[PDB]
Design a protein around this ligand. Structure first.
Ligand SMILES: CCCCCCCCCCCC(=O)O
Length: 122
């Protein structure tokens, strides 16, 4: 759920997830998807796509178990949907950390979301 997702982002990036990514670019946070402005934003587009693979569980609501050991995230649910959900969130946290070097302040509070162009195909 949002809870674990937030914790993983915070752990990997060292940033407050809501303020830093809550409305970033065309895909991060509130609202939907749109053509990515930059690599950070593309992480969010990929993440939203990932959520489409879970049928049997609610990406936003369903809590799950994971471990934060050795600067790594490990998804430990046996339940396949919750395992896959955890893996979606792990991947976006890792992606955002990886793209910290191009994180752009100007896309943080993105009131231009309605100017976004067509999203990338999932
Ligand atoms: C209030 C709890 C915090 C929720 C953390 C998620 C906020 C931004 C996450 C970005 C992920 C995405 O947009 O795909």
């Amino acid at each position: 759920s949002l809870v674990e997702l937030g914790k993983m982002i915070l752990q990997e990036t060292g940033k407050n997830p809501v303020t830093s990514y809550g409305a970033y670019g065309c895909n991060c946070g509130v609202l939907g998807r749109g053509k990515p402005k930059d690599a950070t934003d593309r992480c969010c587009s990929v993440h939203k796509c990932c959520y489409k693979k879970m049928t049997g569980c609610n990406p936003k609501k369903d809590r799950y178990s994971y471990s934060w050991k050795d600067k790594t995230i490990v998804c430990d649910e046996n339940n396949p949907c919750l395992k896959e959900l955890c893996e979606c969130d792990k991947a976006v946290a890792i992606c955002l950390r990886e793209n910290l070097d191009t994180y752009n302040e100007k896309y943080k509070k993105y009131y231009k979301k309605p100017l976004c162009k067509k999203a990338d195909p999932c």
